[PDB]
Design a protein around this motif. Structure first.
Motif, short mmCIF file in Angstrom:
data_model
loop_
_atom_site.label_atom_id
_atom_site.label_comp_id
_atom_site.label_asym_id
_atom_site.label_seq_id
_atom_site.Cartn_x
_atom_site.Cartn_y
_atom_site.Cartn_z
N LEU A 199 1.26 -1.19 0.25
CA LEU A 199 0.17 -0.27 0.01
C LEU A 199 0.48 1.00 0.45
CD1 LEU A 199 -3.32 0.54 2.62
CD2 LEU A 199 -0.94 2.38 2.30
N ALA A 202 2.56 1.66 -3.69
CA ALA A 202 1.65 2.07 -4.36
C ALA A 202 1.28 3.72 -4.31
CB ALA A 202 0.01 1.38 -4.32
N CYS A 203 1.54 4.38 -3.25
CA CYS A 203 0.62 5.75 -2.50
C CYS A 203 2.48 7.01 -2.81
CB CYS A 203 0.29 5.89 -1.64
SG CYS A 203 -1.40 5.04 -0.91
N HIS A 224 -4.82 9.14 -2.03
CA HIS A 224 -4.05 8.19 -1.98
C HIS A 224 -4.95 7.38 -1.75
CE1 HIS A 224 -1.86 11.20 -4.39
NE2 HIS A 224 -1.51 10.46 -5.18
N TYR A 228 -6.25 4.01 -2.94
CA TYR A 228 -6.30 2.66 -3.23
C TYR A 228 -6.82 1.36 -2.24
CZ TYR A 228 -2.30 -1.62 -2.42
OH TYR A 228 -1.66 -2.95 -2.06
HG LIG Z 1 -2.49 4.56 -2.82
#
Ligand SMILES: [Hg+2]
Ligand SMILES: CC(=O)N[C@@H]1[C@@H](O[C@@H]2O[C@H](CO)[C@H](O)[C@H](O)[C@H]2O[C@@H]2O[C@@H](C)[C@@H](O)[C@@H](O)[C@@H]2O)[C@H](O)[C@@H](CO)O[C@H]1O
Ligand SMILES: O=c1ccn([C@@H]2O[C@H](COP(=O)(O)OP(=O)(O)O)[C@@H](O)[C@H]2O)c(=O)[nH]1
Ligand SMILES: [Hg+2]
Ligand SMILES: [Hg+2]
Ligand SMILES: [Hg+2]
Ligand SMILES: [Hg+2]
Ligand SMILES: [Hg+2]
Length: 264
Positions: A199, A202-203, A224, A228
């Protein structure tokens, strides 16, 4: 490998008696929504202790925020995962300003100066929260799962249209008006180390893309996080009992307990 639970005596669950009739206790993707009354903590404590579960609790205390550490840690000692192994990770720019808090057995604290692989070998789950808070009631293993988010106390009863998601298509955190399950808080999320790192990775990448495009999400990290969790459904969702602001929102009947709250 999970060993057998020992004999336990507790009230028989009632199939024809709803847990709570005032709130949603399971999401459309079958993830439980954690509210007081939905779980038997004795059963859960048994399950997680038999696994020798270690929970990492991460907090950032930069500049003036170091002043919130004493109350945060002291109350965590009274309410957070008591009985289980806990490893606190305090990220700060003022190591010498971290208060000396007395910890119970099986609990430790690491100060990391700021200005990874370690988590994978030290804890089973990671819980990331805001530091300007205090625990007021039980916050235990009922929250542990591969990935969880917490319902923002200001939008749990709002329609997706009112959610303060990032609405600009030019942002990686963009979510249109016809999408969205809940509005999650950036101040309380977690899961397994692997899922939490996925996570945050990805952010971090999405925010870099936004920066390169000269755009900053309306609510930054939280925007964000919501994108997600929209695309990667959490395996448990925590009710607002887990992050509340009594000064701003009072104490509604729907909340049988106020477990973690903002500090004025
Ligand atoms: Hg994200
Ligand atoms: C008081 C505040 O500044 N705003 C209130 C809203 O809470 C904020 O919501 C945004 C997203 O829309 C962010 O999540 C922001 O961090 C929130 O404020 C923070 O959390 C709240 C609960 C308070 O503790 C506040 O002090 C803190 O900064 C809230 O959602 C709405 C509806 O209740 O009211 C706003 O005034
Ligand atoms: O070192 C820090 C800095 C910020 N916050 C959290 O960030 C939110 C406040 O954000 P604000 O925009 O007021 O300060 P900033 O994020 O710019 O440092 C609150 O939850 C703070 O507890 C925190 O927990 N530790
Ligand atoms: Hg119940
Ligand atoms: Hg974290
Ligand atoms: Hg955090
Ligand atoms: Hg980020
Ligand atoms: Hg995030």
């Amino acid at each position: 490998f999970m060993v057998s639970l020992p004999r336990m005596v507790y009230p028989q669950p009632k199939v024809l008696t709803p847990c709570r009739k005032d709130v949603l206790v399971v999401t459309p993707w079958l993830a439980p929504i954690v509210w007081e009354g939905t779980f038997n903590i004795d059963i859960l404590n048994e399950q997680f202790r038999l696994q020798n579960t270690t929970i990492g609790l991460t907090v950032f205390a930069i500049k003036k925020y170091v002043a919130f550490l004493k109350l945060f840690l002291e109350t965590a000692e009274k309410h957070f995962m008591v009985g289980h192994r806990v490893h606190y990770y305090v990220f700060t720019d003022q190591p010498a300003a971290v208060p000396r808090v007395t910890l119970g057995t099986g609990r430790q604290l690491s100060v990391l100066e700021v200005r990874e692989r370690r988590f994978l070998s030290e804890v089973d789950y990671l819980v990331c929260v805001d530091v300007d808070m205090e625990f007021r009631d039980h916050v235990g293993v009922e929250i542990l799962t591969p990935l969880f988010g917490t319902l923002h106390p200001g939008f749990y009863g709002s329609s997706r249209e009112a959610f303060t998601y990032e609405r600009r298509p030019q942002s990686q955190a963009y979510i249109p008006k016809d999408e969205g399950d809940f509005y999650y808080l950036g101040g309380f999320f977690g899961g397994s180390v692997q899922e939490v790192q996925r996570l945050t990775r990805a952010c971090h990448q999405a925010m870099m893309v936004d920066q390169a495009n000269g755009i900053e999400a309306v609510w930054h990290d939280e925007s964000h996080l919501n994108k997600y969790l929209l695309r990667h459904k959490p395996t448990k969702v925590l009710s607002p009992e887990y992050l509340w602001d009594q000064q701003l929102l009072g104490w509604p009947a729907v909340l049988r307990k106020l477990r973690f709250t903002a500090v004025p």
